[PDB]
């Protein structure tokens, strides 16, 4: 090879069971710590001091209800480093202050960088074009917008999502009641790219499996394929005719088809990320002003849009006192919005 | 041949620009009826008393909606599951007030979409294809049946069917959360895994094939020109793609068999979405999401809230506000 | 006066026109409600 | 309904400007030597 750099490069790039690479130095420790931090906190760590919640198997939560929760609102956007001014190197206190939250979020963010550098490094060694890394920018845009930008626009990390199954459900419902996030056209484009991607995943897998060439005698058809074979395993011509006649249009170009499969979900995730950057500032699509002006003056005018804001108002009033404990909300029974009987 | 024979030959022709077929003989008129009624109602229908309490909700563009707020509104709670065709009404004006168009549209649409599924089997047989594309479409179709027919049947009313509109859809979602805690239901969780994983594997597959396309073009041309419709040779190197992906994760985590790969691509979203559909269709009979409300209790008996209890508080907000003039008694039992 | 050898013809095939008109019109159908507000 | 008065022109140009961009590019592609 040459010098130590090149000998290191050699060893880093050995063909082994788990490829390492230069990216591996960033990826492996960050991914390991993000994951271990999650399993550690969900197994053993409370959120009593930060949220007033139990959040670990140790306290009696189940896989659905455990989380590594965000720090208290009074922590602001502290990095909350183990050795920082809040925990001052006390591991126990750091855990009770929500230090595992920023630990997981930040190692996780570096780990994703390392993962995408991995996709670039392996593509370059194998001699393929780096579209997989490019597609992975959509996961990165989502993670960064939702777990970093969103809480950075708000008052504190407290309002970032907590790392847990039920905790994320809570995050969805908060976004509905407070941001009317379903109304937002960047979320709608996200939903279209997710459901349209799942649609393309299903329809392309089914079409290939149902236009296969008979390439063996088996009635189980998976053996009748060879990775090295020159020939297409299924008939593009027959698949094109089928869909042209069923749906009116069909793919005819396999290259376009597969690029479109990258395009749709990647673009949808990027659109959802932009809407979340706006929500960081409470810059919501909350209302249609023309609807409100009409409904304010005309008490007989009702749409599904006015119905949903009534639901939001219930969500805010009923959930806020427990969900936002630092606010010390006390909402006397008489002020809570409720319809008849319920 | 005779007229009938020639007719059959035409109906089943593999040569029609759009395949007709016997399923198509039912599909064409029913889809046309649902489409025409839908477009006209979405533009021009007057307000509909969805909850049967003489509180009509405006769905249409001309009555003060936009594309996002507009809907064809479900039929009246007074109707329930009763069949309400136009001829059951005293007038079109009554039919409109009571949400007749909703029933007309959804019944024609469900029948037509079920025939769309049959037609997919039909053409595959005419073309000498394997037959299961229609099984993949059963997943979205099951989901449409769940929200427009099974759920209303369980709850005793088409007024609880999903509205035909963008904001109406969100209304249905939010009320469904209050009433069933769907997020905490494992079948909806499998549906999320199905659609997020479908998106993920869609992007993954698109990117892996795109990354290994064989050089056939110059830097000025779109690489798409490197593939010609109907060519025999595969247009990318799967051994190269597997070589990449097997190293990204580990060798045995990657497919080198395209048939297994494409089966997985079909199966993962279709199965997840079947569980989504069965989630709605079984919450239709009020077998609901997990309830861990007050599950964690300290040594004295104080309730120690978990994230489940915070969900519960958001659910309570939805519950107490929804259909704010329709409940007279303390329990919402359907 | 001398020709620039870097010039290249541009293309948009029919499918691309249809895909692009669909994108634009559907984006307009989605965003127009917000523009009217 | 009291809509934003600029909604109409914003919507019109949003459609027209890029649609016409595409049409210009399509037609001159078709007119190139068969």
């Amino acid at each position: 090879e040459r010098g130590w750099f090149d000998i290191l490069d050699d060893w880093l790039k050995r063909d082994r069971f788990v490829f390492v690479g230069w990216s591996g130095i960033l990826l492996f420790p960050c991914a390991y710590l993000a994951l271990g931090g999650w399993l550690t906190g969900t197994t053993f760590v409370t959120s009593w001091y930060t949220h007033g919640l139990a959040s670990s198997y140790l306290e009696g939560c189940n896989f659905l209800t455990v989380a590594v929760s965000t720090p208290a609102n009074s922590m602001g956007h502290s990095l909350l480093l183990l050795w920082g001014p809040e925990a001052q190197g006390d591991f126990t206190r750091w855990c009770q202050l929500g230090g595992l939250w920023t630990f997981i979020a930040l190692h996780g963010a570096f780990g994703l960088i390392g993962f995408m550098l991995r996709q670039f490094e392996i593509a370059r060694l194998v001699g393929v074009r780096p579209y997989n890394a490019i597609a992975f920018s959509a996961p990165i845009a989502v993670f960064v917008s939702v777990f970093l930008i969103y809480p950075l626009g708000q008052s504190s990390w407290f309002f970032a999502p907590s790392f847990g199954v039920a905790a994320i459900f809570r995050f969805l419902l908060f976004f509905q009641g407070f941001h009317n996030w379903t109304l937002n056209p960047f979320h709608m484009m996200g939903v279209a790219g997710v459901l349209g991607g799942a649609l393309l995943c299903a329809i392309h897998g089914a079409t290939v499996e149902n236009t296969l060439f008979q390439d063996g005698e088996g009635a189980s058809t998976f053996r009748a394929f060879n990775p090295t074979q020159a020939e297409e395993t299924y008939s593009m011509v027959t698949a094109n005719r089928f869909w042209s006649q069923i749906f009116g249009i069909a793919f005819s170009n396999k290259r376009w088809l597969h690029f479109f499969m990258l395009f749709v979900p990647v673009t949808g995730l990027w659109m959802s990320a932009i809407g979340v950057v706006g929500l960081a500032l409470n810059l919501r699509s909350y209302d249609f002003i023309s609807q409100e002006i009409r409904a304010a003056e005309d008490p007989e005018f009702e749409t599904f849009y006015t119905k949903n804001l009534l639901l939001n108002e219930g969500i805010r009033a009923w959930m806020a006192p427990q969900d936002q404990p630092h606010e010390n909300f006390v909402f006397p029974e008489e002020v809570l919005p409720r319809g008849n009987a319920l | 041949a005779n007229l009938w024979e020639r007719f059959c030959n035409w109906v089943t022709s593999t040569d029609n620009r759009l395949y007709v077929g016997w399923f198509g003989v039912i599909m064409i008129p029913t889809l046309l009826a649902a489409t025409i009624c839908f477009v006209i109602a979405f533009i021009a229908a007057p307000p509909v008393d969805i909850d049967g309490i003489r509180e009509p909700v405006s769905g249409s563009l001309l009555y003060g909606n936009n594309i996002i707020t507009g809907a064809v509104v479900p039929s009246s709670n007074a109707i329930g599951l009763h069949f309400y065709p136009i001829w059951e009404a005293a007038s079109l004006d009554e039919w409109l007030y009571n949400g007749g168009p909703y029933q007309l549209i959804i019944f024609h649409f469900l029948l037509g979409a079920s025939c769309y599924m049959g037609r997919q089997w039909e053409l595959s047989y005419r073309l000498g294809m394997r037959p299961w594309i229609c099984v993949a479409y059963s997943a979205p179709l099951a989901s449409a049946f769940a929200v427009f027919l099974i759920y209303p049947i369980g709850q005793g009313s088409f007024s609880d069917g999903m509205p035909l509109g963008i904001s109406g859809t969100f209304n249905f979602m939010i009320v469904f959360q209050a009433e069933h805690n769907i997020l905490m239901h494992p079948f909806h969780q499998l549906g999320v895994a199905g659609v997020f994983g479908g998106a993920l594997f869609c992007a993954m597959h698109g990117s892996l094939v795109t990354s290994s396309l064989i050089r056939e073009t110059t830097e000025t041309e779109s690489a798409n020109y490197g593939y010609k419709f109907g060519q025999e040779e595969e247009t990318y190197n799967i051994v190269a793609a597997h070589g990449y992906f097997g190293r990204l994760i580990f060798q045995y985590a990657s497919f080198n068999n395209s048939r297994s790969l494409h089966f997985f691509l079909a199966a993962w979203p279709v199965v997840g979405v079947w569980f989504a559909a069965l989630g709605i269709s079984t919450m239709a009979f009020n077998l609901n999401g997990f309830n861990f409300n007050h599950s964690v209790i300290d040594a004295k008996g104080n309730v120690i809230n978990t994230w489940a209890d915070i969900i519960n508080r958001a659910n309570l907000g939805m519950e107490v506000m929804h259909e704010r003039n329709a409940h007279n008694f303390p329990l919402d039992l359907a | 006066m001398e020709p620039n050898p870097n010039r290249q013809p541009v293309e948009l095939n029919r499918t691309s026109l249809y895909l692009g008109l669909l994108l634009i019109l559907v984006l307009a159908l989605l965003f127009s409600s917000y523009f009217f507000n | 309904m009291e809509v934003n008065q600029l909604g109409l022109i914003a919507t019109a140009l949003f459609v027209l400007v890029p649609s016409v961009f595409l049409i210009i590019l399509y037609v001159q592609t078709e007119s190139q030597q068969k």
Binding site: - | L61, N66, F229 | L22 | -
Partner: peptide, 30 residues
């Protein structure tokens, strides 16, 4: 004016469906 705009965009899309199906670039083998 808004109803007109929304219905106009919709009508353009249905027209587009018609041209994209019946006046597509026809697929040609090889």
């Amino acid at each position: 004016m808004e109803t007109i705009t929304y219905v106009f965009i919709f009508a353009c899309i249905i027209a587009l469906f018609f041209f994209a199906i019946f006046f597509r670039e026809p697929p040609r083998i090889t």
